[PDB]
Design a protein around this ligand. Structure first.
Ligand SMILES: OC[C@H]1O[C@@](CO)(O[C@H]2O[C@H](CO)[C@@H](O)[C@H](O)[C@H]2O)[C@@H](O)[C@@H]1O
Ligand SMILES: OC[C@H]1O[C@@](CO)(O[C@H]2O[C@H](CO)[C@@H](O)[C@H](O)[C@H]2O)[C@@H](O)[C@@H]1O
Ligand SMILES: OC[C@H]1O[C@H](O)[C@H](O)[C@@H](O)[C@@H]1O
Ligand SMILES: OC[C@H]1O[C@](O)(CO)[C@@H](O)[C@@H]1O
Ligand SMILES: OC[C@H]1O[C@](O)(CO)[C@@H](O)[C@@H]1O
Length: 628
């Protein structure tokens, strides 16, 4: 294997002697050379572990490093300042100052210019982080909501131009907001030029996808593949018009890229560098689990998938240090956490906490949540969870069966209950969700619907507003970067017309992708409305989180409340949080509170609470007590 010094000398061979002397004395080359020294051994090691003695590895690597240098050279000086800042502040992601939001540009603001016009609202809300849903060109009609990408470079013209996107990112940065976008690197649309040219037999795109002559290998693979959208097709493959079969983990119009071809890694690393130099701060690594395949396995979470992501990480450390990764792994918690590492994905979605928030609202019992917060919350140094309540996707019940079994809970039976409960097929349920991907072969099902729909706001359940507050309080205070599904902060309900659009009617996730509700946002400062009640209470929690250092960092210790309905945990040995998941009043006894200070200020309600007597919480009440 080559060394960084050898490879650097060859990078420079493209220059005339006169040009080269100038480059070698330059600040950019000095920084690039330093980062090569520090980070190239990781890049080489990870790529070696995946591709081994492949003839194409060294030529690909040299091509990639040449691109990395050109990319860093071209990179804007303002971005190079963020590179340095984050290179010397790896824990910026862990600051209590960070609060994120996510929205669709079209649904929330019409187009990119409209989105730029909403930036003052984002500042008003206190956001420091904004994830914009897939922005680039995609098939007309059905595109999995933009996740079938036809071009990584050309903006969806319904949203505007690449110039509009540049103005948005600059305007976000001006407003103190990180720009977060998707890196959809497991698959492209079937209309992507790479896909068309690969299928057409263009030798330049040979082996860019997984294409088979018949069902022989697809049948073998399907013995062990999980079905993500069983409504759409069985197993992991779809048939082309010419009779061949292509790997399609997701929709039939999403073709899995073939990372066993090192030139595919190179191609996507080039796409990553392009996004980096737009000034993107965080790339959401979509479908991380699926980027390596192996017969006889689930073709999820394989060692090479992790190694490739670590290879991508090294490329950013070399050529765009400001760019961090957010892993999307929605799976068993033992597998979710493996993507999170300073050298892999520095942050990642926390589906366990999210799913168990909803679980706890249904059961009223904090057992599973307490277990998760006790044993699966704390992370390695320089990493963080992204804690959330809802997303653009369905809710999957991804708690661990093994964990549940310790508590005497059958995972299978419990999921059957949660699914009935949240689609209003259980006596007395307050939830108004919609099924998503019921799989008759496994009994698995997921849930669609907005936060407000799932807590009972559609039917004006008097507890709905407080339920929303409780859920978000936990995401905001457990430690990690909280992510608001924009629209939730004014109680936005389902798009009840989603099923009438023939492009959407077989995908119930569209139920919880409503447009910006002008009527609700107009009432956000009106305490007489649900919208204003939700907004003011969420905004207050955001303000407290961001201003109070007791929330800093990602670590917590749970507190045994001795009440099966009340969750408790402590931040920085200084903030004691209680959340009541019962619709009835619930007490923490004076006996349970004996070790605490005599009195404590509650940041939620603003009163001084006596801890030497029984503490009774109203239904769904949250308390944030300063105990140091
Ligand atoms: O200065 C480096 C050293 O590289 C040698 C070739 O062995 O020339 C290479 O570097 C030049 C300057 O970048 C290139 O113009 C040339 O094409 C490349 O072969 C020497 O010529 C040079 O001294
Ligand atoms: O049920 C409403 C609506 O949802 C769509 C597709 O998302 O199907 C979902 O609901 C069906 C009924 O339970 C499930 O069989 C299916 O798996 C689920 O995705 C439509 O098919 C349906 O009309
Ligand atoms: O009927 C309600 C019960 O159904 C299931 O058994 C669930 O596992 C349990 O949590 C719930 O209380
Ligand atoms: O760490 C400081 C951070 O605060 C922000 O404004 C919000 O993310 C970032 O743009 C900046 O890098
Ligand atoms: O740090 C918080 C501490 O400060 C006080 O208000 C006064 O000492 C205590 O009641 C409280 O425990």
């Amino acid at each position: 294997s080559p060394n960084s010094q050898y490879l650097k000398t060859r990078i420079l061979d493209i220059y005339t002697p006169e040009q080269r002397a100038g480059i070698e004395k330059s600040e950019d080359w000095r920084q690039f050379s330093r980062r090569m020294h520090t980070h190239f051994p990781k890049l080489m090691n990870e790529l070696d572990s995946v591709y081994g003695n492949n003839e194409a590895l060294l030529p690909m690597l040299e091509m990639l490093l040449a691109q990395a240098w050109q990319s860093y050279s071209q990179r804007n000086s303002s971005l190079k300042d963020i590179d340095i800042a984050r290179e010397n502040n790896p824990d910026w992601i862990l600051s209590n100052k960070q609060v994120g939001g996510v929205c669709y540009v079209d649904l929330f603001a019409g187009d990119l210019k409209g989105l730029k016009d909403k930036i003052p609202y984002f500042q008003e809300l206190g956001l420091t982080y904004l994830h914009l849903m897939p922005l680039f060109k995609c098939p007309e009609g059905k595109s999995d909501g933009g996740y079938a990408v036809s071009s990584y470079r050309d903006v969806n013209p319904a949203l505007g131009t690449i110039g509009d996107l540049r103005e948005v990112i600059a305007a976000l940065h001006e407003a103190g907001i990180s720009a977060v976008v998707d890196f959809i690197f497991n698959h492209t649309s079937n209309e992507h030029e790479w896909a068309q040219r690969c299928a057409a037999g263009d030798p330049l795109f040979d082996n860019f996808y997984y294409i088979f002559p018949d069902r022989r290998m697809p049948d073998q693979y399907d013995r062990t593949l999980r079905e993500i959208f069983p409504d759409q097709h069985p197993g992991g493959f779809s048939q082309l018009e010419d009779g061949r079969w292509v790997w399609t983990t997701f929709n039939s119009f999403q073709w899995d890229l073939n990372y066993s071809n090192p030139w595919v890694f190179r191609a996507m690393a080039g796409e990553m560098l392009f996004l980096a130099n737009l000034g993107v701060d965080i790339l959401r690594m979509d479908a991380v689990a699926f980027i390596w395949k192996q017969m006889g396995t689930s073709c999820e979470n394989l060692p090479q998938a992790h190694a490739l992501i670590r290879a991508f990480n090294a490329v950013m450390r070399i050529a765009a240090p400001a760019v961090f990764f957010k892993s999307e792994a929605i799976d068993h918690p033992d597998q979710v956490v493996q993507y999170i590492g300073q050298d892999e994905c520095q942050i990642g979605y926390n589906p366990l906490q999210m799913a168990l928030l909803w679980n706890t609202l249904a059961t009223r019992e904090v057992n599973l949540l307490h277990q998760a917060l006790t044993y699966r919350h704390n992370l390695p140094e320089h990493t963080a969870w992204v804690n959330y309540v809802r997303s653009h996707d369905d809710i999957g019940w991804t708690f661990a069966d093994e964990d549940a079994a310790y508590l005497g809970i059958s995972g299978y039976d419990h999921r059957q209950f949660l699914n009935r409960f949240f689609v209003n097929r259980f006596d007395g349920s307050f939830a108004r969700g919609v099924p998503f991907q019921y799989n008759p072969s496994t009994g698995d099902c997921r849930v669609s619907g907005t936060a407000a729909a799932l807590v009972g706001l559609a039917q004006d359940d008097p507890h709905a507003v407080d339920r929303i507050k409780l859920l978000y309080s936990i995401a905001l205070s457990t430690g990690g970067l909280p992510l608001i599904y924009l629209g939730d902060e004014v109680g936005t309900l389902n798009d009840d017309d989603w099923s009438q659009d023939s492009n959407k009617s077989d995908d119930s996730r569209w139920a919880h992708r409503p447009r910006y509700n002008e009527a609700l946002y107009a009432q956000r400062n009106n305490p007489s409305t649900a919208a204003g009640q939700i907004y003011q209470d969420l905004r207050h929690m955001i303000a407290v989180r961001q201003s109070n250092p007791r929330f800093d960092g990602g670590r917590l210790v749970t507190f045994n409340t001795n009440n099966k309905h009340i969750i408790g945990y402590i931040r920085n040995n200084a903030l004691l949080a209680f959340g009541n998941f019962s619709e009835y009043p619930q007490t923490v006894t004076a006996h349970t509170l004996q070790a605490m200070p005599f009195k404590a200020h509650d940041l939620i309600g603003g009163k001084t609470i006596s801890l030497n007597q029984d503490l009774t919480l109203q239904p769904y009440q949250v308390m944030w007590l300063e105990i140091a």
